[PDB]
Amino acid sequence: NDKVCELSLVPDVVMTYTQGNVLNTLNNVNVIRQHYTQTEYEQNLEQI
């Protein structure tokens, strides 16, 4: 109405929960694309 509007929401789960070092401690994950540290890059260099 003239005086009160409604907001539909969906939570940014990414933003909310992932800050800092969290992601880098998960283990036994099947990764699918990522960027590599110099070291891990040299290792995958042939593949790329």
Added chain:
Amino acid sequence: RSNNDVLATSTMRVHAIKSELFTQLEYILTIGANLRKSFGTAEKPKFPS
């Protein structure tokens, strides 16, 4: 070992080389004359089969 059940791969390279080298030779002289008997001489020439 034979099926197509395996993960895509793209990264073969020459990993290692072994070599059997021929490192000493031997020679076979093959002419059509019996060297092991008498030749004659420049004008008395013997031609041994």
